[PDB]
Amino acid sequence: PTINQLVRKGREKVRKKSKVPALKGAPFRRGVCTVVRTVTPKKPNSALRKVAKVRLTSGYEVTAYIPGEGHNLQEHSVVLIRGGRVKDLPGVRYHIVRGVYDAAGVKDRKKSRSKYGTKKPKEA
Amino acid sequence: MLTDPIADMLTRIRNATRVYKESTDVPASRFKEEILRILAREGFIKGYERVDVDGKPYLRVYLKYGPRRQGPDPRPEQVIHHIRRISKPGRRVYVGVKEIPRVRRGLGIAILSTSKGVLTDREARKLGVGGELICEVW
RNA sequence: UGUGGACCCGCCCCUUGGGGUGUGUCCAAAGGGCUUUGCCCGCUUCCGGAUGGGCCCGCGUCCCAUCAGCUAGUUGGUGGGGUAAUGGCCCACCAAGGCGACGACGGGUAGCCGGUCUGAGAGGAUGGCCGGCCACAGGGGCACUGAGACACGGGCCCCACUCCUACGGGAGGCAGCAGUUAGGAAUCUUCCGCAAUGGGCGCAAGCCUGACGGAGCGACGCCGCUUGGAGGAAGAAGCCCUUCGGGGUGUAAACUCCUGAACCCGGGACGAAACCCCCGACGAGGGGACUGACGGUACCGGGGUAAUAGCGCCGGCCAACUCCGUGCCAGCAGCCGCGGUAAUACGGAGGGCGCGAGCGUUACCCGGAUUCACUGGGCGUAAAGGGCGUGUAGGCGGCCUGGGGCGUCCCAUGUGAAAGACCACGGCUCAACCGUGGGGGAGCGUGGGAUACGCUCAGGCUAGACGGUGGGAGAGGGUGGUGGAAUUCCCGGAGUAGCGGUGAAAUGCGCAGAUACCGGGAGGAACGCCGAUGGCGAAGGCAGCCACCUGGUCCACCCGUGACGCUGAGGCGCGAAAGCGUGGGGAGCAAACCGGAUUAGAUACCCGGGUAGUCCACGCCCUAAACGAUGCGCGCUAGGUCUCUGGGUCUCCUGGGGGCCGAAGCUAACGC
RNA sequence: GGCAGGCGCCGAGGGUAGGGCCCGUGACUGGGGCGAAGUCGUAACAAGGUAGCUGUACCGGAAGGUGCGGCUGGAUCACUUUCU
Ligand SMILES: NC[C@@H]1O[C@H](O[C@H]2[C@@H](O)[C@H](O[C@@H]3[C@@H](O)[C@H](N)C[C@H](N)[C@H]3O[C@H]3O[C@H](CO)[C@@H](O)[C@H](O)[C@H]3N)O[C@@H]2CO)[C@H](N)[C@@H](O)[C@@H]1O
Ligand SMILES: [Mg+2]
Ligand SMILES: [Mg+2]
Ligand SMILES: [Mg+2]
Ligand SMILES: [Mg+2]
Ligand SMILES: [Mg+2]
Ligand SMILES: [Mg+2]
Ligand SMILES: [Mg+2]
Ligand SMILES: [Mg+2]
Ligand SMILES: [Mg+2]
Ligand SMILES: [Mg+2]
Ligand SMILES: [Mg+2]
Ligand SMILES: [Mg+2]
Ligand SMILES: [Mg+2]
Ligand SMILES: [Mg+2]
Ligand SMILES: [Mg+2]
Ligand SMILES: [Mg+2]
Ligand SMILES: [Mg+2]
Ligand SMILES: [Mg+2]
Ligand SMILES: [Mg+2]
Ligand SMILES: [Mg+2]
Ligand SMILES: [Mg+2]
Ligand SMILES: [Mg+2]
Ligand SMILES: [Mg+2]
Ligand SMILES: [Mg+2]
Ligand SMILES: [Mg+2]
Ligand SMILES: [Mg+2]
Ligand SMILES: [Mg+2]
Ligand SMILES: [Mg+2]
Ligand SMILES: [Mg+2]
Ligand SMILES: [Mg+2]
Ligand SMILES: [Mg+2]
Ligand SMILES: [Mg+2]
Ligand SMILES: [Mg+2]
Ligand SMILES: [Mg+2]
Ligand SMILES: [Mg+2]
Ligand SMILES: [Mg+2]
Ligand SMILES: [Mg+2]
Ligand SMILES: [Mg+2]
Ligand SMILES: [Mg+2]
Ligand SMILES: [Mg+2]
Ligand SMILES: [Mg+2]
Ligand SMILES: [Mg+2]
Ligand SMILES: [Mg+2]
Ligand SMILES: [Mg+2]
Ligand SMILES: [Mg+2]
Ligand SMILES: [Mg+2]
Ligand SMILES: [Mg+2]
Ligand SMILES: [Mg+2]
Ligand SMILES: [Mg+2]
Ligand SMILES: [Mg+2]
Ligand SMILES: [Mg+2]
Ligand SMILES: [Mg+2]
Ligand SMILES: [Mg+2]
Ligand SMILES: [Mg+2]
Ligand SMILES: [Mg+2]
Ligand SMILES: [Mg+2]
Ligand SMILES: [Mg+2]
Ligand SMILES: [Mg+2]
Ligand SMILES: [Mg+2]
Ligand SMILES: [Mg+2]
Ligand SMILES: [Mg+2]
Ligand SMILES: [Mg+2]
Ligand SMILES: [Mg+2]
Ligand SMILES: [Mg+2]
Ligand SMILES: [Mg+2]
Ligand SMILES: [Mg+2]
Ligand SMILES: [Mg+2]
Ligand SMILES: [Mg+2]
Ligand SMILES: [Mg+2]
Ligand SMILES: [Mg+2]
Ligand SMILES: [Mg+2]
Ligand SMILES: [Mg+2]
Ligand SMILES: [Mg+2]
Ligand SMILES: [Mg+2]
Ligand SMILES: [Mg+2]
Ligand SMILES: [Mg+2]
Ligand SMILES: [Mg+2]
Ligand SMILES: [Mg+2]
Ligand SMILES: [Mg+2]
Ligand SMILES: [Mg+2]
Ligand SMILES: [Mg+2]
Ligand SMILES: [Mg+2]
Ligand SMILES: [Mg+2]
Ligand SMILES: [Mg+2]
Ligand SMILES: [Mg+2]
Ligand SMILES: [Mg+2]
Ligand SMILES: [Mg+2]
Ligand SMILES: [Mg+2]
Ligand SMILES: [Mg+2]
């Protein structure tokens, strides 16, 4: 546009849309499970995915995913969530942190333990 | 009515050179004249002249190119590879003596009008003046 | 008492209420202590200084125009009130003003800054420690005291909340230090000390100080440091591969020797020398005494133990591959993607890669992203040219001369606190951290200077633009009138068995005589050939002929004016078709609809009917593949050729317009 | 002459009549977006088997059809047969 045009209007700074309204900005938010469900994935992937409709301290009812071999969540499990797209399940935008509150660390895991929150197994 | 006559001249030139004319008429004005004087000094044009195409005054500018080359496409190298208006109407561009451009590490000029006259980048640096950055040529 | 000062009036200089001056009036004071006539601490008035402040102004300071109008103390004036002081700060009377597209008013969000993070920069983001300013102290008002407050730990009142209550009435305010509770993903001790530095009062002794100096807690961050060092096999065992020969972990381990975190023992700080007291004079100077929370810590010395390693990753991006297990499951996944029985992508294992007292995750900011492009992008077909005009504000503006010097440039100067940032030397054994010094800095103020460009004012010019005179082509627009061909209908004639329609048919029309043919009449709509490869128009769009009324345009002459120009937010007007209103009209055609066919079905394509509409007037509507999908204007950059329309010396030159091919060049290509 | 006291203005907030704005809740209802292998057809891409798109107007289970006008971003010297 002309210089004079850029003088009359201007350029226009952009705006970031949060891929995670975990309100408060916060890195995590606590909630209570209201549904532990199973979800069919998409496009070219079939399986049975673990998911939990979670009612957040932020006054938000959002569906969060339950990573790991298997879980232990029930329709009153208090749970801590953390943001993360599950590519396959569309509309699932946060993960449940595993090892915090009612959700228990993945049992008998040896590899990537901090994700899945399971303590160093003992040895002597 | 030409909106910017300095730029119409910088262009007329650029268009002529690009098809290797001999020379070219730009309508006359002291200022345009004042500029070409510099182009000559620094060797971008052979010369200029005050011809008179039908009643009204022009400046015949005579162009200078390279020698013929060998290969497909002989067309000689331009002496004026590049010549661009820096300050245009409705966006004037003034620089202080501290921020006068170093054009192509100096294998090229920048022409600026100052209160001490139309000068090159090195000319204004000595004299210690800034002005209105008119064009770079290199 | 009047050094002096305040006030009214007059004069003087000054120039806003600054400084002098003459009458008149008005205004002072506090005592205390002594190593008591002579000093110490106080008091009064005035002038000056230092510090600290009030007020006023230029410029700067986020998002929404899906907020466009706003204002009545509003805007100004006179007089008064008020204040330390200006002021609609407040008040009375008068005038009718003030602000807004350069964004008023409203709505949203927000303490601002020095700085911080990022970035090559220009920029973007932020205002958390520290420092500066501001505002606030449960919410709302208000004044009093005072140099200062409208006053966090002062007062009054109303409100909400808690607690006491003898029912009337009271008491509170941690956004001070700790601490509790609530909320939350999440954020510390109800610690030591006034030793230092700083503050208040005091002549001092001193007193007060949750300022402050320290310690405590938390890998929250930065820096430093350890978990050892040298030797040590053709190379244990276990675990893992394998082509069954071997290969790997691996000098790793064991083991040999050496050093000696931890831990013990002894010495033990710096920060502190002033206030005070003595001599000298209560001054300069010299002499002496007191005092350490941190802390028996830091640092030194002697003794001395081989003494924590995790975390993530290994399909590509991206450093690192092998076995087993699982079978579109279980699961992974930042994006691409892995898993459907041989998975280097899932889970384990061996091995490997990267960091390491940390390693990952999530969240957020800048970066890469020239992905809001000032630097530094685009719009023929990728997203993007407004449907077209007319024109307002605004932006932009040919040639020559002169004045000013607003922009612009230059010199000198003031400002740009500290911290932080840069560089050097230095202190802690290093660094983190800290000290001293140096350097740089945008911006704004003031004095001086330059005038090429831009602005401005004053002349001049003719090359832009406009006009005169003379010619020209055109479906450019409006109103009236008129011509023939055809369709349908009516009247007459002649004539008889079908016509019509389709792939084929059938609805349909025809003995009330159709179709075909001749003659006459009515009406409505469109204008064949010419006619396109053409013309006109800003676009939509314009086609029989005649006349009238009008618009644009092009050529020649080189006559007039003298930059009168370009673009154009908003405004205004125009704007295919369909659609709407009122009235008229209605041949043909025809959404809807009614039938006939076709089909698996047929709300369709095909056939026979048929209303709105298509037509006219007036008034709306305002859209489009409103297309060249290409804004308008001006300048420059080979040519060939076809065509429409002017002019001149007319084989050829020279304009305006419409096509094609092509130079340079441009383009992602196509193409231009 | 002062003080107490009295009256008045201003005045926090409260009340009543009417407005404008923002948030919550909401019986009903509108369409949207996602989700390997449900149903109807077959509108579009080849002349998509009626060239397509288009503004508008009516109609239709559904894509869609038709009217009017526009566009080429339409194939070629001569036909009607859904799906995967
Ligand atoms: N997202 C689809 C959008 O919605 C419509 O499409 C929606 C429906 O029409 C469509 O239905 C299809 C159906 O056509 C098709 N013949 C069968 C198919 N199973 C269906 O698919 C749907 O349903 C199944 C479960 O029943 C899901 O597994 C599947 O994800 C979903 N697409 O599924 C879509 C919703 O996912 C619009 N027509 C379409 O233009 C548009 O893209
Ligand atoms: Mg993993
Ligand atoms: Mg006196
Ligand atoms: Mg005076
Ligand atoms: Mg006086
Ligand atoms: Mg006097
Ligand atoms: Mg007296
Ligand atoms: Mg005495
Ligand atoms: Mg002062
Ligand atoms: Mg008034
Ligand atoms: Mg007044
Ligand atoms: Mg008014
Ligand atoms: Mg705030
Ligand atoms: Mg950048
Ligand atoms: Mg701060
Ligand atoms: Mg409070
Ligand atoms: Mg308090
Ligand atoms: Mg208390
Ligand atoms: Mg809690
Ligand atoms: Mg102290
Ligand atoms: Mg002190
Ligand atoms: Mg070793
Ligand atoms: Mg030893
Ligand atoms: Mg030793
Ligand atoms: Mg002391
Ligand atoms: Mg003495
Ligand atoms: Mg001394
Ligand atoms: Mg060892
Ligand atoms: Mg690799
Ligand atoms: Mg399984
Ligand atoms: Mg991420
Ligand atoms: Mg396998
Ligand atoms: Mg396989
Ligand atoms: Mg693997
Ligand atoms: Mg991977
Ligand atoms: Mg950028
Ligand atoms: Mg782009
Ligand atoms: Mg487009
Ligand atoms: Mg256009
Ligand atoms: Mg358009
Ligand atoms: Mg104008
Ligand atoms: Mg000019
Ligand atoms: Mg101008
Ligand atoms: Mg001048
Ligand atoms: Mg100036
Ligand atoms: Mg500084
Ligand atoms: Mg920096
Ligand atoms: Mg050092
Ligand atoms: Mg200056
Ligand atoms: Mg000056
Ligand atoms: Mg001058
Ligand atoms: Mg003039
Ligand atoms: Mg004429
Ligand atoms: Mg005509
Ligand atoms: Mg008859
Ligand atoms: Mg019959
Ligand atoms: Mg009969
Ligand atoms: Mg007939
Ligand atoms: Mg007849
Ligand atoms: Mg009739
Ligand atoms: Mg045209
Ligand atoms: Mg057209
Ligand atoms: Mg005319
Ligand atoms: Mg003339
Ligand atoms: Mg003249
Ligand atoms: Mg215009
Ligand atoms: Mg119209
Ligand atoms: Mg119409
Ligand atoms: Mg009508
Ligand atoms: Mg009608
Ligand atoms: Mg009628
Ligand atoms: Mg029909
Ligand atoms: Mg019909
Ligand atoms: Mg009309
Ligand atoms: Mg319009
Ligand atoms: Mg051009
Ligand atoms: Mg002729
Ligand atoms: Mg031409
Ligand atoms: Mg044309
Ligand atoms: Mg080429
Ligand atoms: Mg381009
Ligand atoms: Mg090409
Ligand atoms: Mg009273
Ligand atoms: Mg089809
Ligand atoms: Mg087609
Ligand atoms: Mg309908
Ligand atoms: Mg449709
Ligand atoms: Mg229909
Ligand atoms: Mg059509
Ligand atoms: Mg398109």
JSON list of N, CA, C and O (backbone and C1' of nucleotides) in Angstrom, two decimals, chain C residues 156-168:
[
{"chain": "C", "resi": 156, "resn": "C", "atom": "P", "xyz": [-13.80, 9.12, 65.82]},
{"chain": "C", "resi": 156, "resn": "C", "atom": "O5'", "xyz": [-14.80, 10.00, 64.95]},
{"chain": "C", "resi": 156, "resn": "C", "atom": "C5'", "xyz": [-15.36, 11.18, 65.49]},
{"chain": "C", "resi": 156, "resn": "C", "atom": "C4'", "xyz": [-16.18, 11.92, 64.47]},
{"chain": "C", "resi": 156, "resn": "C", "atom": "C3'", "xyz": [-17.16, 11.07, 63.68]},
{"chain": "C", "resi": 156, "resn": "C", "atom": "O3'", "xyz": [-18.36, 10.78, 64.39]},
{"chain": "C", "resi": 156, "resn": "C", "atom": "C1'", "xyz": [-15.94, 12.40, 62.19]},
{"chain": "C", "resi": 157, "resn": "C", "atom": "P", "xyz": [-18.98, 9.29, 64.38]},
{"chain": "C", "resi": 157, "resn": "C", "atom": "O5'", "xyz": [-19.92, 9.27, 63.10]},
{"chain": "C", "resi": 157, "resn": "C", "atom": "C5'", "xyz": [-20.81, 10.35, 62.86]},
{"chain": "C", "resi": 157, "resn": "C", "atom": "C4'", "xyz": [-21.31, 10.32, 61.45]},
{"chain": "C", "resi": 157, "resn": "C", "atom": "C3'", "xyz": [-21.66, 8.95, 60.89]},
{"chain": "C", "resi": 157, "resn": "C", "atom": "O3'", "xyz": [-22.94, 8.52, 61.30]},
{"chain": "C", "resi": 157, "resn": "C", "atom": "C1'", "xyz": [-20.35, 10.12, 59.33]},
{"chain": "C", "resi": 158, "resn": "C", "atom": "P", "xyz": [-23.32, 6.96, 61.34]},
{"chain": "C", "resi": 158, "resn": "C", "atom": "O5'", "xyz": [-23.49, 6.58, 59.82]},
{"chain": "C", "resi": 158, "resn": "C", "atom": "C5'", "xyz": [-24.56, 7.16, 59.09]},
{"chain": "C", "resi": 158, "resn": "C", "atom": "C4'", "xyz": [-24.53, 6.71, 57.67]},
{"chain": "C", "resi": 158, "resn": "C", "atom": "C3'", "xyz": [-24.32, 5.23, 57.44]},
{"chain": "C", "resi": 158, "resn": "C", "atom": "O3'", "xyz": [-25.50, 4.46, 57.62]},
{"chain": "C", "resi": 158, "resn": "C", "atom": "C1'", "xyz": [-22.86, 6.41, 56.08]},
{"chain": "C", "resi": 159, "resn": "C", "atom": "P", "xyz": [-25.41, 2.93, 58.12]},
{"chain": "C", "resi": 159, "resn": "C", "atom": "O5'", "xyz": [-24.75, 2.16, 56.89]},
{"chain": "C", "resi": 159, "resn": "C", "atom": "C5'", "xyz": [-25.37, 2.13, 55.62]},
{"chain": "C", "resi": 159, "resn": "C", "atom": "C4'", "xyz": [-24.54, 1.36, 54.64]},
{"chain": "C", "resi": 159, "resn": "C", "atom": "C3'", "xyz": [-24.12, -0.03, 55.09]},
{"chain": "C", "resi": 159, "resn": "C", "atom": "O3'", "xyz": [-25.11, -1.01, 54.90]},
{"chain": "C", "resi": 159, "resn": "C", "atom": "C1'", "xyz": [-22.25, 1.10, 54.20]},
{"chain": "C", "resi": 160, "resn": "A", "atom": "P", "xyz": [-25.24, -2.18, 55.98]},
{"chain": "C", "resi": 160, "resn": "A", "atom": "O5'", "xyz": [-24.16, -3.26, 55.54]},
{"chain": "C", "resi": 160, "resn": "A", "atom": "C5'", "xyz": [-24.15, -3.78, 54.22]},
{"chain": "C", "resi": 160, "resn": "A", "atom": "C4'", "xyz": [-22.91, -4.61, 53.98]},
{"chain": "C", "resi": 160, "resn": "A", "atom": "C3'", "xyz": [-22.53, -5.56, 55.11]},
{"chain": "C", "resi": 160, "resn": "A", "atom": "O3'", "xyz": [-23.26, -6.77, 55.10]},
{"chain": "C", "resi": 160, "resn": "A", "atom": "C1'", "xyz": [-20.63, -4.35, 54.43]},
{"chain": "C", "resi": 161, "resn": "C", "atom": "P", "xyz": [-23.52, -7.57, 56.47]},
{"chain": "C", "resi": 161, "resn": "C", "atom": "O5'", "xyz": [-22.06, -7.99, 56.97]},
{"chain": "C", "resi": 161, "resn": "C", "atom": "C5'", "xyz": [-21.46, -9.17, 56.48]},
{"chain": "C", "resi": 161, "resn": "C", "atom": "C4'", "xyz": [-19.99, -9.22, 56.79]},
{"chain": "C", "resi": 161, "resn": "C", "atom": "C3'", "xyz": [-19.61, -9.58, 58.22]},
{"chain": "C", "resi": 161, "resn": "C", "atom": "O3'", "xyz": [-19.75, -10.95, 58.52]},
{"chain": "C", "resi": 161, "resn": "C", "atom": "C1'", "xyz": [-18.32, -7.75, 57.53]},
{"chain": "C", "resi": 162, "resn": "U", "atom": "P", "xyz": [-20.65, -11.37, 59.79]},
{"chain": "C", "resi": 162, "resn": "U", "atom": "O5'", "xyz": [-19.62, -11.39, 61.01]},
{"chain": "C", "resi": 162, "resn": "U", "atom": "C5'", "xyz": [-18.69, -12.44, 61.14]},
{"chain": "C", "resi": 162, "resn": "U", "atom": "C4'", "xyz": [-17.45, -12.00, 61.86]},
{"chain": "C", "resi": 162, "resn": "U", "atom": "C3'", "xyz": [-17.58, -11.89, 63.37]},
{"chain": "C", "resi": 162, "resn": "U", "atom": "O3'", "xyz": [-17.48, -13.13, 64.02]},
{"chain": "C", "resi": 162, "resn": "U", "atom": "C1'", "xyz": [-16.45, -9.99, 62.51]},
{"chain": "C", "resi": 163, "resn": "C", "atom": "P", "xyz": [-18.55, -13.51, 65.15]},
{"chain": "C", "resi": 163, "resn": "C", "atom": "O5'", "xyz": [-18.00, -12.79, 66.46]},
{"chain": "C", "resi": 163, "resn": "C", "atom": "C5'", "xyz": [-16.81, -13.24, 67.09]},
{"chain": "C", "resi": 163, "resn": "C", "atom": "C4'", "xyz": [-16.27, -12.18, 68.00]},
{"chain": "C", "resi": 163, "resn": "C", "atom": "C3'", "xyz": [-17.19, -11.74, 69.12]},
{"chain": "C", "resi": 163, "resn": "C", "atom": "O3'", "xyz": [-17.29, -12.64, 70.20]},
{"chain": "C", "resi": 163, "resn": "C", "atom": "C1'", "xyz": [-16.31, -9.83, 68.08]},
{"chain": "C", "resi": 164, "resn": "C", "atom": "P", "xyz": [-18.66, -12.68, 71.04]},
{"chain": "C", "resi": 164, "resn": "C", "atom": "O5'", "xyz": [-18.53, -11.44, 72.02]},
{"chain": "C", "resi": 164, "resn": "C", "atom": "C5'", "xyz": [-17.43, -11.33, 72.91]},
{"chain": "C", "resi": 164, "resn": "C", "atom": "C4'", "xyz": [-17.52, -10.08, 73.76]},
{"chain": "C", "resi": 164, "resn": "C", "atom": "C3'", "xyz": [-18.83, -9.84, 74.48]},
{"chain": "C", "resi": 164, "resn": "C", "atom": "O3'", "xyz": [-19.02, -10.61, 75.65]},
{"chain": "C", "resi": 164, "resn": "C", "atom": "C1'", "xyz": [-18.19, -7.86, 73.40]},
{"chain": "C", "resi": 165, "resn": "U", "atom": "P", "xyz": [-20.45, -11.29, 75.92]},
{"chain": "C", "resi": 165, "resn": "U", "atom": "O5'", "xyz": [-21.42, -10.05, 76.11]},
{"chain": "C", "resi": 165, "resn": "U", "atom": "C5'", "xyz": [-21.21, -9.11, 77.15]},
{"chain": "C", "resi": 165, "resn": "U", "atom": "C4'", "xyz": [-22.10, -7.90, 76.99]},
{"chain": "C", "resi": 165, "resn": "U", "atom": "C3'", "xyz": [-23.60, -8.16, 76.98]},
{"chain": "C", "resi": 165, "resn": "U", "atom": "O3'", "xyz": [-24.15, -8.42, 78.26]},
{"chain": "C", "resi": 165, "resn": "U", "atom": "C1'", "xyz": [-23.06, -6.66, 75.25]},
{"chain": "C", "resi": 166, "resn": "A", "atom": "P", "xyz": [-25.26, -9.56, 78.43]},
{"chain": "C", "resi": 166, "resn": "A", "atom": "O5'", "xyz": [-26.41, -8.87, 79.29]},
{"chain": "C", "resi": 166, "resn": "A", "atom": "C5'", "xyz": [-27.27, -7.90, 78.70]},
{"chain": "C", "resi": 166, "resn": "A", "atom": "C4'", "xyz": [-27.97, -7.06, 79.75]},
{"chain": "C", "resi": 166, "resn": "A", "atom": "C3'", "xyz": [-27.96, -5.57, 79.46]},
{"chain": "C", "resi": 166, "resn": "A", "atom": "O3'", "xyz": [-29.14, -4.96, 80.01]},
{"chain": "C", "resi": 166, "resn": "A", "atom": "C1'", "xyz": [-26.69, -6.02, 81.42]},
{"chain": "C", "resi": 167, "resn": "C", "atom": "P", "xyz": [-30.52, -4.92, 79.17]},
{"chain": "C", "resi": 167, "resn": "C", "atom": "O5'", "xyz": [-30.30, -3.72, 78.13]},
{"chain": "C", "resi": 167, "resn": "C", "atom": "C5'", "xyz": [-31.36, -2.82, 77.82]},
{"chain": "C", "resi": 167, "resn": "C", "atom": "C4'", "xyz": [-31.57, -2.69, 76.33]},
{"chain": "C", "resi": 167, "resn": "C", "atom": "C3'", "xyz": [-32.82, -3.40, 75.78]},
{"chain": "C", "resi": 167, "resn": "C", "atom": "O3'", "xyz": [-33.57, -2.58, 74.85]},
{"chain": "C", "resi": 167, "resn": "C", "atom": "C1'", "xyz": [-30.86, -4.25, 74.72]},
{"chain": "C", "resi": 168, "resn": "G", "atom": "P", "xyz": [-33.04, -2.06, 73.41]},
{"chain": "C", "resi": 168, "resn": "G", "atom": "O5'", "xyz": [-31.78, -1.15, 73.74]},
{"chain": "C", "resi": 168, "resn": "G", "atom": "C5'", "xyz": [-31.49, 0.03, 73.00]},
{"chain": "C", "resi": 168, "resn": "G", "atom": "C4'", "xyz": [-30.85, 1.09, 73.87]},
{"chain": "C", "resi": 168, "resn": "G", "atom": "C3'", "xyz": [-29.49, 1.59, 73.42]},
{"chain": "C", "resi": 168, "resn": "G", "atom": "O3'", "xyz": [-29.58, 2.62, 72.44]},
{"chain": "C", "resi": 168, "resn": "G", "atom": "C1'", "xyz": [-29.48, 1.17, 75.76]}
]
